[PDB]
Design a protein around this ligand. Structure first.
Ligand SMILES: *C(=O)[C@H](Cc1cnc[nH]1)NC[C@@H]1C[C@H]2CCCC[C@@H]2CN1C(=O)c1ccc(-c2ccccc2)cc1
Ligand SMILES: *C(=O)[C@H](Cc1cnc[nH]1)NC[C@@H]1C[C@H]2CCCC[C@@H]2CN1C(=O)c1ccc(-c2ccccc2)cc1
Lengths: 306, 306
């Protein structure tokens, strides 16, 4: 029993974290095999960035313009190339701790674990959702660039996020590991703001289901709703509209609990309309939206408490 | 910027997690050097436990009564002894991934990271406080026994918790790694309840300070308080009394922000008395009490935002 935001165990990622220096800028990179990945802005000086041309900035560098260090070993760069907003540095040593892995572009609402790193040294791990506005509410200080976000299935690490910058609201932006930003952001130090965000309706519902699997039914009701009537209520409260595809994804949770999705939808609508009345769900006073249906199934018991 | 409950990177602990089987009971153990630690209740059958005598149960076992497996290697037990509520199994192989480490008995209010494990295989990591009632609000299912709680300083892992059982309220109990329970609990399947808990006042204050370091001052006020007047208010709201020692511990946070402890105390008292008025602190609607002063300093910037 219990329900906690839970990260994946970070050791397989820890063994891939290096330090990458270009000039007087130091930041993280991810060492897989004989490649190191890192933000391409490592090659900028506080001046260049206001308006950088990365093609023109990079052609000015050589292999020995970059220093890569793993623990206290120095790795020698023998190649380099740009891929969207990342650099790929080829190194003379293949990482012997490289895990089975792949790169994935994660979708909005999905969650992942972040290994916060400084100077190539892992410092902490927490769990994050990709917000609908393509930002993450992370915890990051200067030097955290190139820290990665990942999920682990079996022995395989699916990397999905590399940190590049903080936005003026204090939220974070970055790329997949093909160097494509999440959201309409760019790696320039300019005026750049997060667009308006929405609550992740599907996650709210998944978490309602966790609460029933864990033994709590107080917020249920005798009513049902159409998908469409649910959505008029959703827009009023700034929730993402619910789609038939989201309804489908809730099938397994619906089945474990015997509560119809749309019956849970009506529960949610009553909650949005009336409040929680001083009560909690799973220890929370607020409706929680950063646990996916997958996260609820992974964490919760397969047997419902009653 | 940001503020997240953040766990320590779990890799150094992952490399110590094994599976320990006695009879038909399987649960975790912690492999350091040539010893495996685990809950001594692994030797019980659902029957024995209702009223076990562990001395009498253990003398009935041999070394080959226990099976220890690390990944897919079988480790051979060559010795065993009881230490309070743990077994120490001596094994024929010393863990080559043993980190620098020690064992610590953590104090109430203090926090640590838990590596949730099943069948010797790490599944997740989250952060926990030791509640004042000596329970943890964990997330654990059957088979999680022998999962450990730890902190990491430099390269050294301070283990402080091994999981033994779940209580009827859904909270968790366990031991330090000398096998002494935290709290008045025992490893018997009997009626056993968590005593009344209190909010960890010191943590509340530390988190108020995080919010100011991060740039938010809205809940401050022009008032001050005596320690003693603060405490009459504290008892009314079920907060732990604040002591001069707690006041001292807040010194560094007080100094970084220029807000006197007792001025923060008066801020807190007004918050308890009036509520948060629909507002949030650090994204929370509620007063948060599972970040220590140390946790705030570790995570927050050393330069206050204004
Ligand atoms: C990376 O470590 C940080 C991440 C962060 C900070 N706080 C929270 N998260 N971001 C780097 C930050 C923003 C990016 C955006 C894209 C262009 C580069 C710019 C770099 N940057 C800086 O603040 C920065 C300022 C100045 C310098 C610098 C370089 C040479 C000489 C003097 C200064 C480098 C980076
Ligand atoms: C350990 O894995 C779980 C931890 C847990 C479960 N949910 C959340 N956290 N606790 C084991 C649980 C409680 C302890 C208390 C101390 C005495 C032993 C008892 C073991 N236990 C059981 O539920 C349990 C029941 C039955 C058996 C069993 C043994 C042999 C044959 C049939 C059954 C073993 C453990």
């Amino acid at each position: 029993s219990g329900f906690r935001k839970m990260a994946f165990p970070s050791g397989k990622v820890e063994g891939c974290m290096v330090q990458v220096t270009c000039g007087t800028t130091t930041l993280n990179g991810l060492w897989l095999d004989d490649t190191v990945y890192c933000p391409r802005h490592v090659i900028c000086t506080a001046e260049d960035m206001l308006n950088p041309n990365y093609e023109d900035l990079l052609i000015r560098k050589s292999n020995h313009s970059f220093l890569v260090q793993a623990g206290n070993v120095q790795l020698r760069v023998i190649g380099h190339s740009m891929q969207n907003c990342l650099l790929r540095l080829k190194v003379d040593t293949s990482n012997p701790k490289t895990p089975k892995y792949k790169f994935v572009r994660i979708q909005p609402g999905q969650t992942f674990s972040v290994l916060a790193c400084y100077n190539g040294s892992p410092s902490g791990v927490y769990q994050c959702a990709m917000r609908p506005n393509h930002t993450i509410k992370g915890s990051f200080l200067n030097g955290s660039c190139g820290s990665v976000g990942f999920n682990i299935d079996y022995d395989c690490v699916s990397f999905c996020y590399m940190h590049h910058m903080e936005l003026p609201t204090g939220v974070h932006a970055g790329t997949d590991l093909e160097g494509k930003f999440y959201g309409p952001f760019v790696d320039i130090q300019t005026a750049q703001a997060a667009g308006t965000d929405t609550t992740i309706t599907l996650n709210v519902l998944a978490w309602l289901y966790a609460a029933v699997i864990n033994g709590d039914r107080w917020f249920l009701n005798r009513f049902t709703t159409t998908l469409n009537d649910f959505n008029l209520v959703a827009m009023k409260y700034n929730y993402e509209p619910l789609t038939q595809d989201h309804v489908d994804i809730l099938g397994p949770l619906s089945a474990q609990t015997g509560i119809a999705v749309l019956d849970m939808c009506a529960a949610l609508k009553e909650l949005l309309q009336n409040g929680m009345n001083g009560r909690t769900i799973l220890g929370s006073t607020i409706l929680e939206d950063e646990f996916t249906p997958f996260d609820v199934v992974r964490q919760c018991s397969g047997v419902t408490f009653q």
